[PDB]
Every structure is written in C-alpha cells, then in structure tokens.
C-alpha cells in the first residue's frame, strides 16, 4: 500500500499465514536500577550540551525526545488502563481538559515513577494556564537544579501526551520551594485559545 | 468487494487496501474510483464533527455512520489520532449487513497490529507502512471476519 | 371526479395568480388600475390568504394526490410571505391551521416550525403522488419528470430552512440533521437539463460550505 502505488491488491480466496514477528505486548516487569537509567539520561544531556548553542534551542532539542515517545506511551497506556487482547471494551476518550490532566495525574506517573504527583491545580487568574507540581522529581534528582533546563524531558513527554489529544499547548517548567519538600518543580502548562474556545463553546 | 483505509490526522492515508470476494472475482468495476477518497474524505468530515461531541459508553466504536446513493459506510475512531474505515459491500445489492459486534472484533483487533508497528521507533508518524507482513496479516485477519 | 378536476385547476390557477398579483412590490403602491387587486399600501395578500384557504379546503375536499401538494405549497408560501415579511403581526392562518389539522402536520405555533411541518406535509403528499400518468403543467407531456418537480420541491425546502442554523453558532441553533435530512437524492438525476443540475449542485455545495463541512 505504497504512497506511489494505488490501493490495489488481490482476492480473499487463499490463506497466507506466512508471518514472522508478532508477540504479546502486556505489562512486563523487569525493573532496572535507577543508576543505569540515570547514566543513560546523563550521557544524553552531555550530548545535548555538546551539540547545541544556547538555552532555548537546547530546551527544544531536549523536548523533541518526549515528542517522539509521548504518542507511543499515550496509546498503549490508555490501551492498558481504559481497556492476545481478549478485550472487554475500550473506555471513554478525553472528554475535556480536566479528565486528561487527571489522566497524567492518575496513571502516567504511576506508570513511570510508581507514585502520583501531588497536585493538579487549576490556576487562579486564568484558565488557559494549568499547573502540575511534582514534589521530588525522580529522573533529575542528582542534577543541581539551579538551572531548570534539565527537567525538560518531562515537559516534552507531557506535551506529546496532549498534542495527540488535540490540545496544542505551551508547556513550561519552573521550580519553586513552597514547602519543606525541597526542589519541587512546577510544570505550569498553557494551551492555545482555540481548543480553549472549543471548550469555550459550551464547557 | 471490501476496501480498508486508515487515514491520518493531516488527511494522509497511512494504510489503504482493497480486496474482493472470488464470488465477485473483481471489485466495483467503474465505481472503484468514486468510492475512494472523496467519499472517505467526507467520512473524515463526519467523524471530524462526530468525535468531539459526547452525543450524536463506547466512545471509540461508532458503527455504520453514513450512506451515499449506492452503498453505506462504517467507521472507528482511535485516540492515537487515527480513524479506521472499512468499506464493504457487493455492488449489485444495497448491502445492509452491519454485523456491529463481530466487526467490532476487527477494529480493536487490527488496532494492535497498528500498535506494534507504531512502537517500531524507526517508524515515524505521517508516513505509510510498507510492511510486507502486516498487510498479509490483515486479509487473513479478515479471513476471520469476512 | 370532474368537479374535483375543475376545482383543482381553477383553485391552483387562482391561488398562484392572486399570490403573485398581491404585494409584488408594495413599498410605493401605485394605486391606479385597481381592477385585479386592492394594490394599496395595506394590500399584502389578505384576499390571497382567504382565496388560498378556500382553495386548500376545496383541494382537500377534492381528494388530489399529485396537484394537491400545491395547495400546501400555496398555504406555506402564504404563511411565509404574508406572515413573515410584510406581516405586521396579522398572521391570519386559521383555516391554514385547520387544513393542517385535516390533511397533515398540525400542532405548531412558531416561526421556522410550522413551515418545516407543512414542508414535511407537502413532501409526504408529493410522495403520495404515486402515479399521476398525465400532463398537468403542459410544457412537456411525454418527456417530463416528477423528478424535475420534486428536486425543486426539496430545494425550496433546503434553501428555506438550511439558513436557520446560523454561522454564529449559539445564535438560533438546532441539531445538525441538515446533512442527515439532506441525503435524499436517491433519484437518478442523469441530465434532464443541465442548468437544473448546476443550480441543484450549487446550492447543495453552498450549504455544506455554509455549515463548515468542506469535504
């Protein structure tokens, strides 16, 4: 079914079971050490400070990895949570913004980091801006986070959880020590006006 | 005389295929070109303004949706972005037969073949699939449910 | 049945004649030559309404099947024109609502509701035109079509209710059954005349471009 070729094929009156590579896809558990994945992230950030010029382009050239695999984690995390495959059903999709940022809050962190980010605060002054704070970020706990440029793996990974969801969204991170919990990072996200106005048709 | 399409987010067909029953032994001669993208292009229009509302609890599957003046169409919407469309029907009769549950056990069943190909990290979005194996799998997966 | 035919032809001709000859353009109202009409500034189809009411009553009492939907067309045009534009809150459609009770589609009390109801009534009566097998408007008597009048019937329907779904969204909305109720061209439509096809596809395309359904 090539782009150059047409949609042409042949009749159904045979049976070609000559297949090679298709397996299970279930939730396996192998649980590698945080030192190993921390070294993986470590030499990745070393490559990005090698090859890139300044602050903002490095921030984008970090968040593109999250945009690579955010779509991928979205669709089978939803296919495991809201649903081989002797399937009962697939449940509801994104209704609005407040179920899908509950869906990061419910079962994305507990898919990744075995806990839950502690709040999902709807903002005071506006509604296009939303804010999630992780309390003690797991994959960047060793980096001295005075530059906050090193946590844009996870701003990239949630932006690709919402760009498939139809909400294009400016996603930023800041870090603010509001509690005795130190080095908690706020992901103050935004949206665009238009799917806010698609929410703003009826709410 | 059955016609599969997977049509993407920016209108690109990431997988589109026909097949025929040998009891028809051909498919829609001289009708195979109007029953292609334009009908499916309007099908993208009706699933575009049918997905985002709750109401015209099974948000993914939608069943038979519309009808041009020779046949009728069915649909499916995934949260991956993709909108699966099968186009079925013998060209002589107006084919009424929407099985609606056993071909519901096709759309959630072809979904994982799309999943494992999407999980190929060399495979991008917005590019079609010349898998020599996943297209030979689906006709035999349609040998389950004709 | 001869009395029914005589009353049918006379009532249809009188309904269309007193319709088009009352308030054709009545914003200056040249009151000379007052033979065929009142023709003053207060002459807006009132005798046309009374004549169309008696015409629809005699058409229902005639019991046609082909020409009889033109009585509903006359009453719907009366309640559209003389009870919408130059109405001045008169809306004298009591025998029109009586014919809505008698033949089809009573029980409505709003603009864009009873017009849709009587449009459904006239569409059902033209569906009840099963086989006239004759010639009534005698422009064509052997090569003509009931298709060629029914496409004009539902495009009158489509232009007179498709605009009511405003393009400003929340202002005057109804459900998007316009496409659902627009897929009604099951007929063949293979070139009776090319300008009928051009105006039918221009309006069918223009309403989809109006409602934002491009494809």
From Swiss-Prot, chain A:
Keywords: Autophagy, Endoplasmic reticulum, ER-Golgi transport, Golgi apparatus, Transport. The keyword Lipid metabolism does not apply. Pfam families: TRAPP. Its main location: Golgi. It is found in: Golgi apparatus, cis-Golgi network; Endoplasmic reticulum; Preautophagosomal structure. One of its GO terms (biological process) is endoplasmic reticulum to Golgi vesicle-mediated transport. One of its GO terms (cellular component) is cytosol. Belongs to the TRAPP small subunits family. BET3 subfamily. Component of the TRAPP I, TRAPP II and TRAPP III complexes which act as guanine nucleotide exchange factors (GEF) for YPT1. TRAPP I plays a key role in the late stages of endoplasmic reticulum to Golgi traffic. TRAPP II plays a role in intra-Golgi transport. TRAPP III plays a role in autophagosome formation. Present with 8350 molecules/cell in log phase SD medium. Part of the multisubunit TRAPP (transport protein particle) I complex composed of BET3, BET5, TRS20, TRS23, TRS31 and TRS33. Part of the multisubunit TRAPP (transport protein particle) II complex composed of BET3, BET5, TRS20, TRS23, TRS31, TRS33, TRS65, TRS85, TRS120 and TRS130. Part of the multisubunit TRAPP (transport protein particle) III complex composed of BET3, BET5, TRS20, TRS23, TRS31, TRS33 and TRS85. This is Trafficking protein particle complex subunit 31.
Curated annotation (Swiss-Prot), chain B:
Gene3D superfamilies: 3.30.450.70. InterPro entries: Longin-like_dom_sf (IPR011012), Sedlin (IPR006722). It is found in: Golgi apparatus, cis-Golgi network; Endoplasmic reticulum; Preautophagosomal structure. Signal peptide: none annotated. Keywords: Autophagy, Endoplasmic reticulum, ER-Golgi transport, Golgi apparatus, Transport. It holds the Pfam family Sedlin_N. One of its GO terms (cellular component) is nucleus. It comes from the Eukaryota. One of its GO terms (biological process) is intra-Golgi vesicle-mediated transport. Its main location: Golgi. Component of the TRAPP I, TRAPP II and TRAPP III complexes which act as guanine nucleotide exchange factors (GEF) for YPT1. TRAPP I plays a key role in the late stages of endoplasmic reticulum to Golgi traffic. TRAPP II plays a role in intra-Golgi transport. TRAPP III plays a role in autophagosome formation. Part of the multisubunit TRAPP (transport protein particle) I complex composed of BET3, BET5, TRS20, TRS23, TRS31 and TRS33. Part of the multisubunit TRAPP (transport protein particle) II complex composed of BET3, BET5, TRS20, TRS23, TRS31, TRS33, TRS65, TRS85, TRS120 and TRS130. Part of the multisubunit TRAPP (transport protein particle) III complex composed of BET3, BET5, TRS20, TRS23, TRS31, TRS33 and TRS85. Belongs to the TRAPP small subunits family. Sedlin subfamily. Present with 1200 molecules/cell in log phase SD medium. This is Trafficking protein particle complex subunit 20.
UniProtKB/Swiss-Prot annotation, chain C:
It comes from the Eukaryota. It is found in: Golgi apparatus, cis-Golgi network. The modification Phosphoserine is found at residues 66, 74. Specific subunit of the TRAPP II complex, a highly conserved vesicle tethering complex that functions in the late Golgi as a guanine nucleotide exchanger (GEF) for the Golgi YPT1 GTPase. TRS120 plays a role in the YPT GEF activity of TRAPP II in concert with the two other TRAPP II-specific subunits TRS65 and TRS130. The gene is TRS120. This is Trafficking protein particle complex II-specific subunit 120. Present with 259 molecules/cell in log phase SD medium. Disulfide bonds: none annotated. Belongs to the TRS120 family.
